[model samples]
Target: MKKIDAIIKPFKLDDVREALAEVGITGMTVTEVKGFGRQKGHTELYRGAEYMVDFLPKVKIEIVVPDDIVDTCVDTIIRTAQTGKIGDGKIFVFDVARVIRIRTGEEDDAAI
Candidate 1:
């Protein structure tokens, strides 16, 4: 199994989610996050003053799936989330040792 963590532009969440659904991904965890990468944040003005915003808003989507579909899920995210601009965010994949569905006591692939 693998765990896919995708950090994407906030506006792209809906599109990514729908695309993943089309490819047979049924569940995921979404989080609101803030960070800076190559884009290096930006400046904002208020009350005739300018302030540097060091962290930008991002959406992090996490999903755990069986090995066979990992590539499909990653490709789906990339195709749906790419904006051809900096700060488009990143994707991280990690090996998952196990998965458990608490209520039903399912484990491994069944749990996933």
Candidate 2:
């Protein structure tokens, strides 16, 4: 099995989700995160105060899929999250030893 994790600009979440669904992915997890890339960070001014916002707001998406679906899942994420501009985001893939569906006791791909 494989776990595909993507961190993308927050506004791009819906597009990426729809694209993954089109590729047969029905479930995934989304989390709000903050981080910085080569672009470093930015400064913001609020109420006469200027501060450095050292990290950008991002959406972290994770999906666990059967090994055979790894390539398609990654491809879908890349295509969907791409803006051909700054902050398009990054995707990482990892090997998953196993997964279990706690409620029903299903395992492996079924659990996913």
Candidate 3:
């Protein structure tokens, strides 16, 4: 099994989610997070109040899939989320030892 953690620009979440679904991923976790990369952070002005936004808003999507589907899932995310610009975020993949669906007691790939 494989676990994929995709961190993307906040505004790209919906498109990425939809694309994942199209590729047969029906379940995953979504989280609103704050992070920074090469862009570091930025300055913003709200009603004439200037502030340094140390961390930018982001969306983190977590999915566990069977090994065979890992590449496709990652590809779907990139195609949907890439904006040809910086701060597009990143994708990390890891080996998943096991997974369990608490309500159904399913394990392994079935759990995913």
Candidate 4:
């Protein structure tokens, strides 16, 4: 199994989710996050003064899928999230040792 973590621009969340659904991915965790990378930070002005905004808003999507669909999932996120611009964010994949469904006690593939 694999755990896919994708950090994407906030506005792209809906597109990513719909694309993933088209590919049969039904479950995922979404988080509102703030961070900066190559885009660094931007300056904002208020009351005739400029301030550095160190962190930018981003959306983090996490999903665990069986090995076979890892590539599909990654591709779906990339295709739906890319904007031909910087700060498009990144995707990370990790090995998942196990998974379990709390109420049903289903494990591994079944649980997923």
lDDT of each: 0.85, 0.78, 0.81, 0.84
Clashes of each: 0, 0, 0, 0
Error of 1 at 104 (Å): 1.0
| C-alpha TM-score for every candidate | 0.85, 0.81, 0.83, 0.85
TM-score of decoy 4: 0.85
Find the number of clashing residue pairs for candidate 3: 0
TM-score (C-alpha, index-matched) for candidate 2: 0.81
How far residue 72's Cα lies from its native spot in candidate 3, in Å, is: 0.6
What does the lDDT read for residue 29 in candidate 1?
98
Give lDDT for model 4.
0.84
Consecutive 10-residue window with the lowest summed lDDT within model 3? 40-49
- Cα miss at 20, model 3 (Å)? 0.6
lDDT of model 3 at residue 66?
85
Q: For model 2, where is the 10-residue window of minimal lDDT?
A: 40-49
Model 2: per-residue Cα lDDT over 1-112, one tens digit each:
7788898988889998888888888898999988666452434423243574456688999988887888888887788788787678888988877788899988765333
Q: Point out the higher-scoring one by lDDT: 2 or 4.
A: 4
Task: Name the regions of candidate 4 deviating beyond 4 angstroms.
Answer: 40-50, 109-112
